Each structure stands twice: as C-alpha cells, then as structure tokens.
Amino acid sequence: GPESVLVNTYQWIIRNWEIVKIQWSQDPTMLYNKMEFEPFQSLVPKATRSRYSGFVRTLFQQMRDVLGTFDTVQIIKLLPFAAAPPEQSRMQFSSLTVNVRGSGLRILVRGNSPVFNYNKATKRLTVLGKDAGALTEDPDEGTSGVESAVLRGFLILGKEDKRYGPALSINELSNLAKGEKANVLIGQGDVVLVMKRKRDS
C-alpha cells in the first residue's frame, strides 16, 4: 500500500546510499529519472509534482554550489520529489504533500515531521511509524550550521539575530536584495537568520 511505498522508497535510498550519493554528486539527472522513484511519484499530487521537483532540484544545486554544506538526511528526505519533470516557479514550499493515509500528509522541508522522522540519538530513520534503517557517519557532513537546501535562493545562516530586525514570513522575502540578511519565521516558533544569495543555482 501507499504507506509501504513511502517506507520502501526511503529504505531503498539508504540501502543504496553509496551509489546514490555518487550520482547525486556527479550525474544527478540519471539519478532523478530512475524508475525506482515512480511509485513515490504516483503518491505526489499530479498538480504540484513538477513544481515540487523544480524546487527540490534547485535546492540540491544550491547544496552542490555552496561548499561544505552537505546534509545527508536532507538529500534522502527530498530526493524522491526530484523525480518528476521539473517546472520553475518563484514560490517557497515549507512542506511537500504525499497522498498516503487516504489524504494529504505533508513532509516538512526543514527538519522532522510525523511522516519523516530522523532520530539523531539512534541514527535511524522512521517513516510513517516504520523503521527505514540506519544512517552511517559521513565525514563529508556539514558541521557549520549553514543550511543551503531549505529555501530557494537563500542560505539559513543560524540563530535569529535581533540586529537584522523582526522576522519575515517565507512569503515576504522576495524584496530582499542580493546578499541582504533577515530573520525569518521558518516554522513551529523557530526564527532563523537567512541570507539571500548573490548568484542563483
């Protein structure tokens, strides 16, 4: 069933992470088009599939372009959304819908959610209340706290910094100049400092 499709997709990515990481790094196009992501894509609503994919593919390229910000879990989380033919847009998506429990459940782009829950204490991924397997320590993992694959055209720099003013919503960022910093209401009471990048991916 649909719940098992999600679990099995993420399980598959983890089991095959050595080759998936390599392709993600050097031939993402042939990774994104793998048939193994088609069942997951069937669960992504037809109307938003392509925009989700353009968004995610752009976020992944930010990660490649902004050196030393590799985030293993973020790649695994978002990867299956990259499989649809991409469509461009200006929008920020804070969450991505999958059709599972008879209905839309949303995976949060930043951090854990009920659908996608990575446990840093146990090093295991849980997807819809099911184990999707263990992650191994990767020396390439970014340790600086800069998040390059959450917002399209922005880096999350770290904690709220009151100097840069009161928080903007995700939908209020489009007037920021290249290189300008602001506080942003990223989710769940969390305010983070962000920077609009000068060059887009």
Author numbering: 541 to 741
Verbatim from the authors:
Viral determinants of virulence and transmissibility are still poorly understood, although lysine at position 627 of the polymerase subunit PB2 (PB2-627K) is now known to be important for avian influenza virus adaptation to mammals. Here, we report that a basic amino acid at position 591 of PB2 can compensate for the lack of PB2-627K and allows efficient replication of highly pathogenic H5N1 and pandemic H1N1 viruses in mammalian species. Our data indicated that a basic amino acid at PB2-591 can compensate for PB2-627K in mammalian adaptation; interestingly, these two residues are positioned near each other on the surface of PB2.
To address this critical question, we present here the high-resolution crystal structure of the C-terminal domain of PB2 from a 2009 H1N1 pandemic virus (A/Mexico/InDRE4487/2009); the PB2 proteins of A/Mexico/InDRE4487/2009 and Cal04 are identical in the region crystallized; i.e., amino acid residues 538–741. The PB2 protein of the pandemic H1N1 virus shows an altered polar surface when compared to the avian H5N1 PB2-627K protein. Interestingly, our structure of the pandemic H1N1 PB2 protein reveals that PB2-591R fills the cleft found in H5N1 PB2 proteins in this area (compare Fig. 4A and 4B). In particular, the side chains of R591 and S590 in the structure of H1N1 PB2 occupy what would otherwise be the positively charged cleft in the H5N1 PB2. PB2-591R is located 4 Ångstrom from PB2-627E, with the side chain of R591 rotated away from PB2-627E and participating in hydrogen-bonded and water-mediated hydrogen bond networks with the main chain carbonyl backbone between residues A587 and T588, even though the two residues have space to assume rotomers that could form a neutralizing salt bridge. The R591 residue in H1N1 PB2 thus affects both the shape and charges on the surface of the protein, which may affect its interaction with other viral and/or host factors. Our H1N1 structure shows that while the side chain of PB2-590S is in close proximity (<4 Ångstroms) to 627E, the hydroxyl moiety points away from the glutamatic acid and does not participate in hydrogen bonds or polar interactions with the side chains of 591R or 627E. Furthermore, the side chain atoms of PB2-590S also protrude into the positively charged cleft and may provide a steric platform that reduces the conformational flexibility of neighboring residue 627E. These findings suggest that PB2-590S constrains any side chain at position 627. Our X-ray crystal structure of the C-terminal portion of a pandemic H1N1 PB2 protein reveals changes in surface shape and charge created by PB2-591R which may prevent an inhibitory host factor as suggested by Mehle & Doudna from binding to PB2, hence allowing efficient influenza virus replication.
